[PDB]
A and B are shown apart, each in its own frame.
Chain A
């Protein structure tokens, strides 16, 4: 499932802004 894929990904925590 897309949800399972997301939850296993490296970007489920707080995301920092880029510049």
Chain B
């Protein structure tokens, strides 16, 4: 049963939520190999755990940069939630710790690369290809939302492809446990729901909107709202006009009209029927939800894998010296990390 599974999942989550894991490794236990991705203020590096020989992906956050960008509470949210969740399509946090300068989150290394890079290279995914990935996000949001979690940064750049061709969601940077509504302007411009842009107070329905944008971008090769600058993107989003490529199927367009829906009383995922309005939509008719969950469905493609610590599926980045300090920075702000 779904109710039985979710009831057990919530019990599991709450135990870890209430007593988070803390300080479970240290920096000199890893060799830092190569940068896998860099943002405005996070760096993720391929590392090798010396004692086990395992490769991991280590997210490094400069505490001082976190403070300057007013991301303290978000970063605490990020680690507290990621350490507490457990789902087949969520990246696993193995260790976390901090030093004088930085915060560290050590995840399983997902070697297949970002969905983003494959999507840009191939141009677009076929509808069945897009559906395979979309099904996994649907189940993932069902899991997250049941725990009163909002994810808040769905995009191809935060979705990794594993050795079996399945999705691993990374970047819990804006994840938040909230029962009521919330107000923070965060996400990625192309993926923001109108209510975020318009400072209205919003809820988990923004994740469903974001799913609409994701499906569109996967199937079209480009987002439904694009421009050179964020402000121009926001105008298009608030406008609530979406044009679909002529190759889009009738079922796909209908589903997207219901996800990319400005009216919250009408947006799929947010109605009385909740997630089942999406699961039961004609576009997903060929989807076997249990088989997706159990990872028994054949993947559209398997990424190339040359070796245990191969980074071929990732762009190269300029390397930077790790921040180091003789004195502890921002001790009080990150005491719980």
Contacts and interface: CB of A to CB of B under 8 A. Distances in A.
B87 interface: no
Interface string B150-170: 000101010000000000000
Contacts, number: 56
Contacts of B315: 14
Interface string A1-19: 0110010011110111111
A5 B222 CA distance: 10
Interface residues of B, number: 36
A5 B257 CA distance: 23
Given A11-B190, A11-B226, A12-B120, A19 B243 contact: no
Given A2-B222, A3-B221, A11-B190, A19 B228 contact: no
Given A9-B228, A17-B153, A17-B186, 20 more contacts: A2-B220, A2-B222, A2-B243, A2-B245, A6-B222, A9-B227, A10-B229, A11-B226, A11-B227, A12-B120, A15-B188, A15-B189, A16-B39, A16-B188, A17-B40, A17-B171, A18-B185, A18-B186, A19-B184, A19-B186
9 contacts: A2-B222, A3-B221, A14-B37, A14-B315, A15-B189, A17-B153, A18-B185, A18-B186, A19-B184
